[PDB]
Swiss-Prot record:
Residues 1-221 form the FAD-binding FR-type domain. The chain holds residues 661 to 1049 of 1049 of the full protein. It is found in: Cytoplasm. It comes from Priestia megaterium (strain ATCC 14581 / DSM 32 / CCUG 1817 / JCM 2506 / NBRC 15308 / NCIMB 9376 / NCTC 10342 / NRRL B-14308 / VKM B-512 / Ford 19). This protein is a target of protein engineering. Its selectivity-directing and activity-enhancing mutations have been extensively studied and the designed mutations allow this enzyme to act on non-native substrates and/or in order to enhance production of synthetically desirable end-products. Induction: By pentobarbital. Expression is negatively regulated by repressor bm3R1 at the transcriptional level. This is Bifunctional cytochrome P450/NADPH--P450 reductase. Functions as a fatty acid monooxygenase. Catalyzes hydroxylation of fatty acids at omega-1, omega-2 and omega-3 positions. Shows activity toward medium and long-chain fatty acids, with optimum chain lengths of 12, 14 and 16 carbons (lauric, myristic, and palmitic acids). Able to metabolize some of these primary metabolites to secondary and tertiary products. Marginal activity towards short chain lengths of 8-10 carbons. Hydroxylates highly branched fatty acids, which play an essential role in membrane fluidity regulation. The lineage of its organism: Bacteria, Bacillati, Bacillota, Bacilli, Bacillales.
Amino acid sequence: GAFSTNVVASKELQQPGSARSTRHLEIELPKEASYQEGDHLGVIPRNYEGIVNRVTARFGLDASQQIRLEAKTVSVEELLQYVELQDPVTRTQLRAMAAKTVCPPHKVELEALLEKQAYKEQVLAKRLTMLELLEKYPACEMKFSEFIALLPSIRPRYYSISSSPRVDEKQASITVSVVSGEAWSGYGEYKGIASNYLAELQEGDTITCFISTPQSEFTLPKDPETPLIMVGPGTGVAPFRGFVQARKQLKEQGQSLGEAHLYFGCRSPHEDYLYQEELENAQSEGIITLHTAFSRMPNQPKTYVQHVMEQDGKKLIELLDQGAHFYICGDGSQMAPAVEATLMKSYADVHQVSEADARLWLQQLEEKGRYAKDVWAG
Ligand SMILES: Cc1cc2nc3c(=O)[nH]c(=O)nc-3n(C[C@H](O)[C@H](O)[C@H](O)COP(=O)(O)OP(=O)(O)OC[C@H]3O[C@@H](n4cnc5c(N)ncnc54)[C@H](O)[C@@H]3O)c2cc1C
């Protein structure tokens, strides 16, 4: 149930000279909103200027032109804030373009993409959009009013809140990796919509957002003495920053804290060691034990989080046999499965049991509520 609120801070987490960006934003919450560690912020993004301007150039329109679809009048530039502009082209979109195409070979090409293999390999695997194909085919006679009606409604993007409400219940932070690269479609440079939107926000800007609690619970154990193992390289650190803040307040309120291991991984401490100072300070203060893995250090082997976990396997498996909860956040496509595989291998090795037994062990851990994931694909 979306609300509109102000940005209180917006800044760069990576170091000067990094070729990449990760943003930290703080966002104010109204009275009616609240959150918990492990919650998500749903952000309704705006489409960036460059992509809007590509649409208006292609159709020969002024951004400010007032129009009415068939029922209020609204500007072209504002209508373009309601739709997705870089989803893969759909078959309905392709058929629509083909019907409006007056150069025969260009119509053959569009219709070729409807076929099973071409669509899979040339549209979906490359993320080729309707807009890119309209730019390739300036003579395709689709109208603006038809373009806009064929597109999907703009979707929320989700971010793992990276603060604890025990610090300030009405302010939440998020930690955003800025997606950009050469477009897989081959049409210039790609910018992820919500991450570049958030990247451009500044203090004082307004944002429309909502609190969303995930289906799979991602929360601290009830007892602060229960041990924790947290694996969150890169932007996967985000929810665990929240857990670090909650533990810090629990300690300042007199509670006694158990062991908490944070496995953090990034390219280099000279580039993308997010929240390094706060995390080094939490460690000094006994809130966590920090284990870092640097993947791109001159004169050192490439080290990932799971390589350190495997060295620490006896200790991690001992903590788990004592009741620890295990948490993975960040990349779900390659990192999370490898971290899972390493944990299970450590169990098999420590307890001299088979891999099927290790998988059943992990399955039971999940069923007890002690193996949680906040992961996403990228
Ligand atoms: C539960 C959950 C929690 C999350 N937590 C966080 C978080 O804490 N921090 C964070 O940064 N993200 C998080 N995400 C991811 C986030 O919601 C967005 O998906 C991410 O910011 C990308 O959105 P976007 O709008 O910028 O890019 P979009 O415009 O939506 O594009 C993203 C898509 O573009 C594809 N793509 C990437 N590069 C290229 C390229 N060069 N050419 C063509 N296509 C490309 C991607 O593979 C993906 O399919 C989370 C996601 C989920 C589901």
